[PDB]
Design a protein that fits this description.
Chains A, E: It is found in: Bacterial flagellum basal body. Chains A, E: It comes from Salmonella typhimurium. Chains A, E: Belongs to the flagella basal body rod proteins family. Chains A, E: This is Flagellar hook protein FlgE. This is part of a larger assembly, with six copies of chain A. The first copy, chain A, contains no helices and two strands. With about 50 residues, chain A is mainly β. Chain A has a two-stranded antiparallel sheet with strand order 1-2. In chain A, a hairpin with a 5-residue loop joins strand 1 and strand 2. Chain A starts with about 30 loop residues before the first strand and ends in a 7-residue tail after the last strand. Chains B and D meet through helix 1 of B and helix 1 of D.
Chain lengths: ~50, ~50, ~50, ~50, ~50, ~50
């Protein structure tokens, strides 16, 4: 049986891009997000915009 | 990478030509001396992109 | 448009079902809403279960 | 101004100070020449490393 | 999946070209242009011409 | 922002960083070639067996 596909949640490398809205975590945390439906999601891609 | 210096090269070339323009205009009457005034660039990067 | 104004001409409707597994696929890429699935609940995307 | 009739005004440039400035600017210019030399040297080691 | 090709809006060096009609922005700003259709466009090249 | 009279906006492309991203993108492409090669290798190894 395939017991489960578990991601490796270690810290990835922090490539310093000079973009202002490219904040990123290097610890346990997670970005909270919603979408237009109001469902709550969670991510670590910190590439941001308006 | 190039940016940093090639503006440094252009700044130093204008500095040399201002000095040569001062020395060439030594003892011509009513001349006023010249000194180049420079400035450094920055951006949203915290590194400095030249002169 | 050539005056630099847009206008909307439609919003593509989407349809969910009671069960999707009881749909009658006809002789093309389409399915037919039947007795086995009931009426399709209608609505735009980005909203609710769509 | 304070205007005089017969005497004429010489240039305000002090020549030995400008010789010192030309020495400083010459070694500054060749130091920037050495930084373009080092940075296309690292660009061609990026080229021919492959 | 390619979410999007993001432009990076860090300004480059303001290389002093001795020409006159070559005005360039080094901040958030953007030049406004039109073409023969009257269609609006926006850019950052400063090389301009009568 | 403010905009300068004679200077012109050079581009923001660092040559070195885009070369060293190009090497990594090349090896990413060749490893995607390796996974399509191992997937059509497993497809013909179960096609060829009866």
């Amino acid at each position: 049986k395939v017991a489960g596909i578990t991601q490796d949640f270690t810290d990835g490398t922090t490539t310093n891009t000079g973009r202002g809205l490219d904040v990123a975590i290097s610890q346990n945390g997670f970005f909270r997000l919603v979408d237009s439906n109001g469902s709550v999601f969670y991510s670590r891609n910190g590439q941001f915009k308006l | 990478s190039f940016s940093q210096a090639v503006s440094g090269l252009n700044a130093a070339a204008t500095n040399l030509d201002v000095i040569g323009n001062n020395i060439a205009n030594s003892a011509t009457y009513g001349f006023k001396s010249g000194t180049a005034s420079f400035a450094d660039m920055f951006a949203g990067s915290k590194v400095g992109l030249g002169v | 448009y050539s005056n630099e104004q847009e206008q909307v001409l439609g919003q593509i409707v989407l349809a969910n079902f009671a069960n999707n597994e009881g749909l009658a696929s006809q002789g093309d890429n389409v399915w037919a809403a039947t007795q086995a699935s009931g009426v399709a609940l209608l609505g735009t995307a980005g909203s609710g279960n769509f | 101004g304070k205007l005089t009739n017969g005497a004429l005004e010489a240039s305000n440039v002090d020549l030995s100070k400008e010789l010192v400035n030309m020495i400083v600017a010459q070694r500054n210019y060749q130091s920037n020449a050495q930084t373009i030399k080092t940075q296309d040297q690292i660009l061609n080691t990026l080229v021919n490393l492959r």
